[PDB]
């Protein structure tokens, strides 16, 4: 096995034994010492020797992955562990629990043990490129397993999060040490505590970040009759371009899928090594990507990538410099965004007189070349993927496909059986999903995307997301792993609950992710679901994160590219809950009160003059509604706030 891969497999399971005890190092080693697939001695050594007391007498070689696994645990992170400790949600601590005085039980861990033995016996196999599968299984299995159950520590970190960050860190460490011509890790690191602190301060990591330039305009120049079918696929397409870009990058750097920490909007974040070759490769890849985008769009989309040197000592939130490097990489990203092209680039750019046809009615774009029936090529593929997005759920990176990808690649759609056939074919494919878990078919990458399906449109943004992502919890929990887990929770919510909750609403999910919620549907349904989503968020954020949202009513068949640019408890309790219901009951009780009667009411209210108050009184008198109903309307009209509220309620009434 590749020593890097041995590192990967061992690190990923270094702290597994806790779950067995909760049903240490030695417990994990014995348990993992039972399995034909995973019986590698060095992988077992990583698990058996991840504690200092164990490393003291392990008598391992000067070049051992166990030492790297140990430093990974330390960088990622009196000691009475309660097996019944519940995991706590960070969201409270952000602006200062799961399954409220709840407590776990022993039998749950035993159940997981059975599950893990089963999936180890039948689902998992070791090979040159099977780490991703193992990581997928770990993620699916441990997502609410507490990592540290120390009573004196604020328990909010997943065992899965612990494992992933540790593996990423260790991989980084291995690359950095090997490239620095260092092999005697026992003496390079473990020799002295001062030597360990020297390595902590030694810049060994780069934080790398990526950003699409042109989100809004390219997502939003749609005018055709397939507005839903177009937009639903466009959002997915840009997202998948991001996904394929990042995956290609991770492949090139020979790094693991664990090393991705967050994706969203056009942003993505990774922890990579601080070596020269890595930087050259980053240079080459960046140039290539820019070449591809320019060969493609030339303004509409671009990728800017920026990286910053760092030592894990700051990753330990030692001086609060983790937030500083995050802000530095954000400023660096904006600097790359400013300088997008060179002199020769634009020199070619402004000199390209080409015989072209006209704009694709779907694609408000002239540069791309229509062929037949005013239809180009890339747009045509967008319509095709939209038709197959709902029924088919599996996507494959193939050399021949209907969708053009940046790295001279193509995307197609398949079934679960076709994906199994590709495993037998042993083709260079990756599986991209519709939130499909427990698959275990070849490279089963469960990518997250929420596909659920006058008009109403609601757009929402997290208000305090800039501060939450960087400052988050001040001075004591700004660990890289910890903000990662915060990101993870937010991501999983915004990509899973958005699927689940939408069940009862006549809504199609158009754009969800990062902090952007772009939903369209039926006006009444849109308003109701928006209320539902606000309440559900306030539950899941424990009232710690807030959202600002707007709903606008637009005529059908409008160009949605123009609708989008158009776009609480007060609204819920007072207007909808109080006024709307009583008005509805009254109009239920008294018929003939059509839009004529209500419209006269509207006229009476809209002209705010006292004589109009008298007129409203008389008109109410001519009705036959119960005296209490008419008197309530009259009293509401007297108050400016209550009149504005009644007006809004009745406008909703129609």
């Amino acid at each position: 096995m590749n020593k890097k891969n041995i590192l990967m497999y061992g690190s990923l399971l270094h702290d597994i034994g806790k779950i067995i005890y909760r049903s240490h190092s030695k417990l994990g080693h014995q348990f993992l010492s039972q399995f034909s697939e995973f019986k590698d001695n060095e992988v077992l050594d990583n698990v058996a020797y991840h504690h200092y007391k164990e490393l003291a007498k392990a008598n391992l070689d000067n070049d051992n992955t166990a030492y790297i696994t140990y430093i990974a645990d330390n960088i990622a992170s009196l000691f009475n562990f309660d097996k019944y400790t519940p995991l706590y949600s960070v969201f409270n601590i952000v602006n200062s629990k799961f399954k409220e005085n709840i407590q776990y039980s022993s039998g749950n861990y035993t159940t997981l043990m059975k599950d893990m033995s089963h999936d180890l016996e039948h689902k998992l196999s070791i090979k040159e490129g099977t780490f991703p599968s193992l990581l997928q299984w770990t993620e699916s299995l441990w997502q609410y397993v507490p990592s540290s159950t120390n009573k004196n520590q604020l328990i909010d970190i997943s065992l899965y999060d612990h494992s992933r960050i540790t593996c990423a860190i260790a991989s980084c460490i291995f690359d950095y040490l090997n490239e620095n011509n260092i092999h005697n890790y026992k003496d390079e690191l473990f020799s002295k505590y001062e030597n360990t602190k020297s390595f902590y301060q030694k810049e060994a990591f780069l934080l790398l970040s990526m950003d699409m330039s042109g989100i809004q305009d390219f997502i939003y120049n749609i005018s055709g009759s397939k507005a839903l079918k177009s937009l639903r696929s466009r959002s997915f397409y840009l997202e998948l371009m991001l996904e394929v870009i990042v995956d290609q990058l991770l492949e090139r750097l020979e790094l693991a899928r664990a090393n991705l920490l967050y994706t969203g909007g056009g942003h993505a974040y990774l922890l990579v090594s601080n070596t020269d070759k890595v930087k050259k490769k980053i240079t080459q890849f960046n140039n290539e990507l820019k070449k591809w985008f320019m060969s493609e769009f030339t303004t509409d989309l671009s990728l800017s990538m920026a990286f910053e040197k760092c030592s894990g000592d700051d990753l330990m939130n030692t001086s609060g410099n983790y937030r500083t490097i995050w802000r530095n990489v954000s400023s660096k990203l904006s600097d790359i965004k400013a300088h997008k092209y060179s002199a020769e680039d634009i020199l070619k750019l402004n000199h390209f007189h080409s015989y072209g046809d006209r704009e694709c009615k779907e694609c408000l774009r002239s540069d791309i070349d229509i062929n037949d029936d005013g239809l180009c090529s890339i747009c045509e593929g967008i319509i095709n993927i939209s038709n197959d997005l709902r029924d088919k759920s599996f996507f494959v990176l193939s050399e021949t496909g209907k969708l053009k990808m940046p790295f001279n690649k193509f995307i197609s759609v398949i079934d679960y059986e076709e994906a199994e056939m590709l495993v037998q074919n042993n083709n260079q494919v990756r599986i991209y999903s519709k939130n499909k878990p427990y698959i275990g078919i070849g490279i089963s990458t469960n990518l997250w995307m929420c596909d659920y399906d006058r008009l109403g449109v609601v757009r929402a943004d997290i208000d305090n997301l800039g501060a939450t992502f960087i400052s988050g919890i001040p001075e004591k929990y700004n660990s890289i792993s910890r903000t990662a887990t915060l990101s993870r929770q937010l991501s999983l919510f915004f990509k899973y609950e958005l699927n689940h909750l939408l069940e009862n609403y006549q809504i199609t999910a158009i754009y969800s992710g990062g902090d952007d919620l772009f939903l369209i549907g039926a006006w009444d349904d849109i308003i109701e679901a928006s209320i539902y989503i606000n309440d559900k968020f306030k539950e899941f954020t424990l009232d710690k994160l807030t959202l600002s949202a707007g709903v606008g009513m637009f005529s059908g068949k409008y160009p949605v590219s123009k609708m989008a640019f158009e776009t609480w408890d007060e609204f819920k309790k007072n207007i909808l809950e109080e006024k709307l219901l009583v008005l509805q009951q009254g109009f239920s009780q008294t018929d003939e009160h059509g839009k004529a009667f209500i419209y006269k009411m509207l006229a009476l209210l809209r002209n705010n003059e006292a004589i109009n108050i008298a007129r409203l009184a008389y008109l109410l008198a001519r009705s036959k509604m119960n005296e209490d109903f008419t008197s309530k309307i009259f009293n509401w009209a007297q108050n400016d706030k209550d009149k504005n509220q009644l007006i809004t309620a009745l406008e909703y009434y129609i």
């Binding site: 059509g594 839009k595 004529a596």
Partner: protein
């Protein structure tokens, strides 16, 4: 090369109804005062004058869809309430816009189906501005004759919806014609 300016007022003898929102009427999303979008004027004028007969229409309003480029010779803007109508109505406390109740009868059922149409008030005045860029000195007289006929037709016809059903008759008053670009005389051009 000269431009001739034609401004005046148009009076709603029977209530007007454009309704770009539609049963609303065109307004400003701020002033909330009725306007008559000029393009509507242009469309009605063109339909009428073309129905009077073609080159002349192309000369007047411009199409450039048959490969022949001529460019519009007439610019018609929307109009607004004059200050006069606003002050009179505020003084007399008259609403600007009427809501007419309508009804429709099914046959073989004889049931009633209520309807609502928002009409501009009778008697209000709109200040309109036309601009005629005389690109050919030796044709302008002809053109104005044509524009005259167009105006004349509109005088006995309607704008907007339901015009068969009894709304949209307008009138033209206080038309004055002035030259504002170039040095071309306009003391003999006449429009009622």
């Amino acid at each position: 090369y000269s431009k001739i300016k034609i401004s005046g007022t148009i009076e709603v003898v029977t209530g007007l109804h454009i309704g770009g929102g539609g049963s609303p009427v065109v307004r400003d999303l701020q002033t909330k005062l009725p306007i008559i979008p000029g393009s509507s004027i242009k469309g009605k004028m063109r339909n009428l004058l073309a129905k009077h007969f073609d080159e002349r229409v192309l000369r007047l309003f411009g199409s450039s869809e048959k490969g022949n480029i001529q460019r519009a010779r007439l610019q018609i803007s929307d109009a607004f309430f004059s200050e006069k109508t606003k002050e009179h109505f505020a003084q007399n406390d008259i609403a600007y816009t009427e809501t007419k109740f309508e009804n429709t009868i099914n046959r073989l059922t004889a049931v009633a189906n209520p309807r609502q149409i928002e009409r501009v008030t009778r008697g209000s005045e709109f200040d309109f501005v036309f601009i005629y860029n005389v690109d050919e000195e030796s044709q302008v007289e002809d053109d104005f004759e044509n524009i005259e006929k167009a105006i004349h037709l509109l005088e006995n016809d309607y704008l907007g919806g339901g015009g068969t059903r009894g709304n949209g008759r307008i009138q033209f008053k206080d038309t004055n014609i002035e030259t504002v670009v170039g040095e071309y005389d306009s003391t003999n051009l006449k429009i009622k």
